Amino acid sequence: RAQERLATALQKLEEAEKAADESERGMKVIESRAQKDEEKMEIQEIQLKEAKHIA
Amino acid sequence: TTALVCDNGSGLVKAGFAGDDAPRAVFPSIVGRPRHQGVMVGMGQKDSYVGDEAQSKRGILTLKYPIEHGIITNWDDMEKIWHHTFYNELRVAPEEHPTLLTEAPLNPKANREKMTQIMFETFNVPAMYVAIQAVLSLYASGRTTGIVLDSGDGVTHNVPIYEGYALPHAIMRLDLAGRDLTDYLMKILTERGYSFVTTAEREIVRDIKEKLCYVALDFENEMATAASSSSLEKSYELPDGQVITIGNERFRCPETLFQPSFIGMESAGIHETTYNSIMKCDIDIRKDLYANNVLSGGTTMYPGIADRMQKEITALAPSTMKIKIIAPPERKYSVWIGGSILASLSTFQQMWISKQEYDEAGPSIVHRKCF
Amino acid sequence: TTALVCDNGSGLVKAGFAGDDAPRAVFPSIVGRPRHQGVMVGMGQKDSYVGDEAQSKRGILTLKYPIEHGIITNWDDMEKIWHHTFYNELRVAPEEHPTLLTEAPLNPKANREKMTQIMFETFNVPAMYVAIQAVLSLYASGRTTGIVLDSGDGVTHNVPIYEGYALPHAIMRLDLAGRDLTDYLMKILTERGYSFVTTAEREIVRDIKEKLCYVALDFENEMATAASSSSLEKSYELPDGQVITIGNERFRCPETLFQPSFIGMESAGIHETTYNSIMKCDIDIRKDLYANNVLSGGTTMYPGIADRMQKEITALAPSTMKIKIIAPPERKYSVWIGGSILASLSTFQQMWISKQEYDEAGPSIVHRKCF
Amino acid sequence: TTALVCDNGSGLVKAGFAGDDAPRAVFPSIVGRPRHQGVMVGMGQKDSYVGDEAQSKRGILTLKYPIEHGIITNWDDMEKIWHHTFYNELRVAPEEHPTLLTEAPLNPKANREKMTQIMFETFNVPAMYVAIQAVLSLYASGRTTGIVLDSGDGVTHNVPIYEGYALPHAIMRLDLAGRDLTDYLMKILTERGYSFVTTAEREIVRDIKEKLCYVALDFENEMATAASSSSLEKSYELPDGQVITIGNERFRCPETLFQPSFIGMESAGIHETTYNSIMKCDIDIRKDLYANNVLSGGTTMYPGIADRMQKEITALAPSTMKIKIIAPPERKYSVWIGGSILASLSTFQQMWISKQEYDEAGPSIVHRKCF
Ligand SMILES: Nc1ncnc2c1ncn2[C@@H]1O[C@H](COP(=O)(O)OP(=O)(O)O)[C@@H](O)[C@H]1O
Ligand SMILES: Nc1ncnc2c1ncn2[C@@H]1O[C@H](COP(=O)(O)OP(=O)(O)O)[C@@H](O)[C@H]1O
């Protein structure tokens, strides 16, 4: 019984670690998406001010 | 009757039937041979394993690729690969099936000629045909206009097409691809003490690359953030243990596509050869080409490559033009999708190279109007 | 016809027929000669006793082993051993039976060549073959991969095999075995007053070792347990009477296998040469090797040696792999069992060295692909 | 002030002053510790012998090499090596001497980082610098182009240099060297009857190798010559008498450099990695590289290695090239000679890494333009 529960706890650890590291990858790609969003934002706000001043 | 669609490529054979949504047989194009002694009598072991079987016995075999950069350099190995694909992965008799094969632009002529000679004499198909990979990518993409960047495993190329007319003088071909990215990643992993020298460890490194590498949006800022923080470090577990920790070489590897000087090449990045193919085209179609920039092939599968290439091409092109990069999720199989579509088209049934045409005209029939 | 399987070993001869489940003749590999004068006329006594008879006449003879560490040092004695085995224990005519002999890895070549020359010239067998002990052990174990640790009485060796291919650069051989354990026990038994010096008291000490020694799962804790308690102290009754009591040297004797510095050797324990053989193999067969660690030979018969080996190799290898040690109850005879299997294989009947091949190519024909 | 050129190597430390014609101190990079108990009270044994003394007390020590394949694995042992070099062999105070250190291509970065951290903090040198061994070989050879093959004792590498510019993408490194040749010679002598197992017998085997081994011009013909004649056998005198006679083992050991499958490596010989580095280089400089093939390091010192490598590279290259192999008699010390030249150059005096720069920027300063 001790060995059985050892192995089951191990496989559960494996599953949890899979989920957690996939979430880490997702949050990293999301924060990169967010900085790219922000830089596109600054560029488009600047061209917005240009267009509005020239208009 | 049905046609087979075998997309060879340089490092992943994928085949199937014309009229399906996907290939039913995808395996590496490797041929392994045992390099050790062999002691157990009665084991009855073979002399060469091909395909996915050779991947389970990497620790015993020496792995060869029969296709270096598009070009086939080992015809015996390639004949073995084709035999395996026909009889063991697909289980079809190739004497009753037309076969559609693919190749990259600007290859030698003897490659294509010897390919058809094999397919008619050895495997004895009733008909066959060789297609350009970029055209099939464009079929599968649902377009008839666009510049397609097909980064495979041995060769990268751009092929601009407009309204179904291909502009051959603007085709670019570059010999930087996934195999060179794997070699560069092996070379820069040694900075942390990991060493992979065996042909069987090249596969471990390829899996590392596929699972962990990505394209940085800004290379200098990513280098700075990797130097400062430690939030980029990611671990990988080898077939044994000693989990390896990978830092900035997560994104220094695929950056070789945008800075080929990393591996000592003189040429320019993929963004710049794409832009150069554009500016090589006419002037009346450059807007459509900017708006229909199609990616395909396995080396275009890194996270962030679409955004990076859009940033670069947008910085290059004029400001009044809207750049767009089409990157489907099934990019790796686009050539096969397009090949299946094309071979199922009823108009195409007059374009095959029949066996009698070959018998009467020699293998030269392949560069002829029977393309 | 039937083949004989003679597992010479070093300190125990095991012979039989190919196709049986066990050897039918197991006797010590000793040759004794009388050392006293001999007074009774008409006794008609012999000049040299071989095998199990010498162990009866121990008190009168000097017992010599003709095999030191795998290597044969006395060819006349070894020829007597073989003659006894063929004619008195098995009762067969060796000119009608092929003979399969066994040998340890990394022995001199003249050993094997002279063995072949004897078997063809003196005993006149029709065919013969020399096999490696570890391979035959793996046959008998039912595996086809796995790293085998064959600790006999002369030598200890690891031989990693994967899919029937042996990796010769990773073969390890150590000259620590049961004979050295017997000598160490003779030496440390003098701390309690018992003195065994004669060549025939070594057999008594070997019996003590076999019947009372065991491997401690933890050496310092057993040292302290013996220093405090007396629950691990056991007794033994000599052929003379006068029982002897064995204390903590019940487990200090086989601990020499894990700490060869006890007998002044430089090398590392069996648990560490096994791991070094693993780490000298490839990277993508190490998981299978960790999971298929096979023990054979008489010196692996101690109680607790499998559990100790597992604890040690587990503390050595990475924490994410299942380390498993295969230790059958019929370990001591594994080499012979595998030899019988091999010689009965119908595929093997073409691997014999026939007599005509020898007559035409000399004894050098032994090192050919029949190696 | 004058600089110190310490080519720490891997298996031989070579030190001296910049501006000399040869190293002043040459001794093995070995740290020995006593492994027996020690009974004579009052003689005051020490706990670790380092250098040439450990070879005198070799019989009662365990010899460790602090550096395995270029890489340092024992930093405490390496600090002892350096301390011995500075104080007990050169008799200088490193607080007043710049120190040039040498390293192989493609090592971990922590190697250089810890090396400079130690040199600045433990030894307090005023400046230091880490150079590549192949560049220094090419200095000492009086060339400015050429492909240099530097075979030391842990690592072999090719570094193609043209006109003072190095081609980093063509640098090849191989982990087969003199230490693996010694291990193969041990393992291959065991088949003639001699066994050397201890770390103190490894040194005797290394001496046998240096003194009797050579490279065959034609391996198969020399094998047949040894199998038929007996004119190849030399005798060697062990440090206790009992001469040993070796036959084809003389040319079978260094043949591992040209067939690394002998020791179970998959890679290609040195003659083939040299040619592959050349073929990676640009097409316009391959003629000069073919003409300037420079050998250095102790493992390039066998008799016949230059002729063998010329035969091989000539059979590989096109038949219209002049293959030429430069093998000076002072090959073994080429790295040190070039290091002395470099450190004495007057242009070099602003390329040291000063103590101020280090205290400013941390050990990361090593990989900067001050390489
Ligand atoms: N998810 C991924 N990320 C990065 N590279 C990948 C990924 N998947 C595959 N690759 C690379 O793509 C290459 C295979 O591309 P593929 O489409 O098979 O070309 P080909 O069929 O011409 O060999 C492999 O070398 C692999 O390294
Ligand atoms: N139960 C046991 N416990 C410990 N040692 C044993 C046991 N049985 C046999 N041995 C040892 O094994 C040795 C014989 O091993 P064996 O397998 O016969 O090798 P070989 O056939 O080469 O002599 C003897 O020296 C004996 O001391």
Ligand SMILES: Nc1ncnc2c1ncn2[C@@H]1O[C@H](COP(=O)(O)OP(=O)(O)O)[C@@H](O)[C@H]1O
């Ligand atoms: N005459 C020789 N023939 C063959 N090998 C030699 C000879 N002299 C030295 N060696 C080998 O060279 C190695 C030392 O090479 P060396 O130039 O000292 O490299 P490092 O300085 O990095 O140790 C030793 O292992 C030795 O076996």
